[PDB]
Amino acid sequence: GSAVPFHGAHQAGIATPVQDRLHFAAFDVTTEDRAAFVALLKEWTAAARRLTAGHAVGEGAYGGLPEAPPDDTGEALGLKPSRLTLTIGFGPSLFTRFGLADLRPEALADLPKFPGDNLDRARSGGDLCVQACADDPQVAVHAIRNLARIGFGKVVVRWSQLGFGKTSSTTPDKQTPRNLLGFKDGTRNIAGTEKDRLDRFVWAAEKDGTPWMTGGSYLVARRIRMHIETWDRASLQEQEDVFGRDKGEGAPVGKAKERDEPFLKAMKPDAHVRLAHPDSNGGATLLRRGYSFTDGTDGLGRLDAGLFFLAYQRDIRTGFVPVQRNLATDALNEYIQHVGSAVFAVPPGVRDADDWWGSTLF
Amino acid sequence: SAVPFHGAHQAGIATPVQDRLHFAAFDVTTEDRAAFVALLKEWTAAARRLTAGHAVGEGAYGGLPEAPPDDTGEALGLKPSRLTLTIGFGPSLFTRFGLADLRPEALADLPKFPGDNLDRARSGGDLCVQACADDPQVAVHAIRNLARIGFGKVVVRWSQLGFGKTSSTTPDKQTPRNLLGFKDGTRNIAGTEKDRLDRFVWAAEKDGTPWMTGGSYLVARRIRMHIETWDRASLQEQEDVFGRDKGEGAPVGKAKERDEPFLKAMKPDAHVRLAHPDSNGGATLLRRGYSFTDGTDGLGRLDAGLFFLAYQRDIRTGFVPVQRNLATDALNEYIQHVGSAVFAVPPGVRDADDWWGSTLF
Numbered sequence A: 001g002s003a004v005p006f007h008g009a010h011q012a013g014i015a016t017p018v019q020d021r022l023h024f025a026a027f028d029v030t031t032e033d034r035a036a037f038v039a040l041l042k043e044w045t046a047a048a049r050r051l052t053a054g055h056a057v058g059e060g061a062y063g064g065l066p067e068a069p070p071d072d073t074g075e076a077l078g079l080k081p082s083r084l085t086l087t088i089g090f091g092p093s094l095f096t097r098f099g100l101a102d103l104r105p106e107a108l109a110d111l112p113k114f115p116g117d118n119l120d121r122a123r124s125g126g127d128l129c130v131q132a133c134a135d136d137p138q139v140a141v142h143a144i145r146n147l148a149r150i151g152f153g154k155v156v157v158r159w160s161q162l163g164f165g166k167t168s169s170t171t172p173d174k175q176t177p178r179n180l181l182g183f184k185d186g187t188r189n190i191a192g193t194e195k196d197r198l199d200r201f202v203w204a205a206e207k208d209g210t211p212w213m214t215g216g217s218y219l220v221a222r223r224i225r226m227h228i229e230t231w232d233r234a235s236l237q238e239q240e241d242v243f244g245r246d247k248g249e250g251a252p253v254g255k256a257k258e259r260d261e262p263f264l265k266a267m268k269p270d271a272h273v274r275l276a277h278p279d280s281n282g283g284a285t286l287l288r289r290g291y292s293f294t295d296g297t298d299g300l301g302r303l304d305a306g307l308f309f310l311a312y313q314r315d316i317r318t319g320f321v322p323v324q325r326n327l328a329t330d331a332l333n334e335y336i337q338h339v340g341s342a343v344f345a346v347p348p349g350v351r352d353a354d355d356w357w358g359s360t361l362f
Numbered sequence B: 001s002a003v004p005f006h007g008a009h010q011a012g013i014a015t016p017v018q019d020r021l022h023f024a025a026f027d028v029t030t031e032d033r034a035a036f037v038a039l040l041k042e043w044t045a046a047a048r049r050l051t052a053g054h055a056v057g058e059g060a061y062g063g064l065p066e067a068p069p070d071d072t073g074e075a076l077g078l079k080p081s082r083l084t085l086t087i088g089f090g091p092s093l094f095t096r097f098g099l100a101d102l103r104p105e106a107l108a109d110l111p112k113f114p115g116d117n118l119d120r121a122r123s124g125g126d127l128c129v130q131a132c133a134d135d136p137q138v139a140v141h142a143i144r145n146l147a148r149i150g151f152g153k154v155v156v157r158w159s160q161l162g163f164g165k166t167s168s169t170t171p172d173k174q175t176p177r178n179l180l181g182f183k184d185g186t187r188n189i190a191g192t193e194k195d196r197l198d199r200f201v202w203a204a205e206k207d208g209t210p211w212m213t214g215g216s217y218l219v220a221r222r223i224r225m226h227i228e229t230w231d232r233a234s235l236q237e238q239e240d241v242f243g244r245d246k247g248e249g250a251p252v253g254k255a256k257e258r259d260e261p262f263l264k265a266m267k268p269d270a271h272v273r274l275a276h277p278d279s280n281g282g283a284t285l286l287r288r289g290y291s292f293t294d295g296t297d298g299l300g301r302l303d304a305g306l307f308f309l310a311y312q313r314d315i316r317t318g319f320v321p322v323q324r325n326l327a328t329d330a331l332n333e334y335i336q337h338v339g340s341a342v343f344a345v346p347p348g349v350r351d352a353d354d355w356w357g358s359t360l361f
């Protein structure tokens, strides 16, 4: 229930241990006033400082003037900080505004069309995003709700996504969670202690060619529907062939323990782990940080399940794109479909109580 | 860490309220009474396993490679997490299997209420399973696997995820707050009150339907909140809507949350005043609902609210009179009922040989 420090060279919510709950919101900007938008950014940062510490935003949830609405909507009163992190990102469409065209980073690449893509334009894109992660879903909702409220008239929510449970790990010393297909997800990720690997693969460096992004990262978000009816009638051998790990232990095929190193030649040629592995992609490596979701039924008598996939990388062109291209022949494609997509530039961290979100850009 | 599955009553009604909810309504697709009884028996065996934290059937792995696993596996390595599984039968079940004359009179259809805007697709249902647990993945895995075992005899009509408190960070006799920011549950029937449970919650044999003795009747209402509207109301408006202050949750004019309300100091259309048993001829409810937030609708608005669950000894003397009295509730300005269902929740599974529905079939 402890707090995660909000200030740093990097934003929390990336290398941070993965919290149990996600509330992800993408916003469109509805003001042309660059000065108004900057004011919003400073205001949102002040609220984030309170929220991540478990304090009410503004002057609190009650005790103000009786005839004025409370500053804080109040549903997180009495709750601990619950490891809340708030991570902000800027979509490519934002750089068409406030005369920011020349500042859009090369590494913020538009994604090409991928085979099987069936993207819903209304749950894709967005001028910016806020990733709220916490162990308590009420805490995450309260944060998004109160940010949107403060931004009323300058931003609106385009689409949002709640994840009821993580399917990723930045802490290999703790139990690896399972996704809704029943497999451990997160074994060979990048850990928050591997500061060398984070520099090489996650944080944008100054020499990369966009100085304001130094210390930031780039985020790919993909909403992926799972065909659980199809999956649930496949044999155990089929399911394990698709991945290249056994279902029970999550060990690479042929080996005994989850964390034994995969021997790719023993896997089927179209096995997910074989195709995604850095060694098959010129060393391309990703920080995976996704969550499971279910949004009711599909109206055809079945549950509707999926995975909200999130990846952080130093350069979308050298991270997500090569690996996703290599999955064109993935055996997993038979059981999933990508139905939403968006990319963001995640700026550097808020360095101290004088700094603010996006200060290096504006 | 676990809640016993067997008893005179089903668990998940008087037992401690768990942090998360996965509620699913099912429609029945078979006409064959025997095939349905067989499914009820299979479901009971699976529920025994799930509530103890074990996989269904012969497990999630280690079986014959050319066979699909009995259990879909996403709860491997998790704990029982206080999972309870509570089944109920909707009025429409009784049009099948020759059961028409066994429908309890207390399982009454709900009137249309002023301001209802009920989504047909998220209403009704031949039966329900309420899955409560401290880990949402444990609850989802239970619904996912019962549906799979039932495939071909039942389909999922609608499903709802909900959250209450998070018990790892929140003390347990701290009242949870709803998404309007007000404490919710202060004056409620507690699981410790055996006498009030008998008076108000459990069906008795003299009520008229012997096979329902020890069961209860369930009303589910999906209630959307107009969040953005609520959040623009003054603090005084919000407190006047309920008749309690927002910070402490004390009845107006009182000092503490648990001070008994003085109804005459509340506005005549305040929610607590209209819902209180003294304003409804003594009618008293066991509320056991959960908040929901499903995302955002087409207008950028927050799709969130209260998934209201009330258990009672007779719908006609429980939910119906109280809800009728809310016709003029000041709260109506900020909420809308958009889904509804009622269910007869049978008596408990007595022992290892018993099964869900045995007293009816």
Ligand code: HEM
Binding pocket: A179, A181, A183, A184, A185, A186, A187, A188, A189, A222, A224, A226, A243, A245, A262, A272, A273, A276, A277, A278, A286, A307, A309, A320, A323, A324, A336
């Ligand atoms: C529903 C969609 C997906 C599911 C169920 C899934 C499942 C898995 C599983 C079970 C593993 C093995 C354990 C681990 O090392 O984490 C894995 C590994 C991995 N996945 Fe996926 N995955 C999905 C989508 C994706 C996508 C879209 C990408 C990249 C575009 C990706 C990239 C990777 C990578 C890089 C690894 C680590 C391979 C290694 O280095 O050993 N996955 N995935």
Ligand code: HEM
Binding pocket: B178, B180, B182, B183, B184, B185, B186, B187, B188, B221, B223, B225, B242, B244, B261, B271, B272, B275, B276, B277, B285, B305, B306, B308, B319, B322, B323, B335
């Ligand atoms: C979004 C919908 C609703 C919200 C936010 C809400 C909220 C509240 C709040 C804050 C209280 C006072 C604290 C407490 O004793 O629990 C309360 C009391 C109560 N409510 Fe509601 N309520 C809702 C719907 C309903 C409905 C539909 C019913 C019945 C049909 C109902 C019946 C009651 C009862 C019986 C009490 C106890 C009053 C007393 O005995 O002091 N509520 N509710």
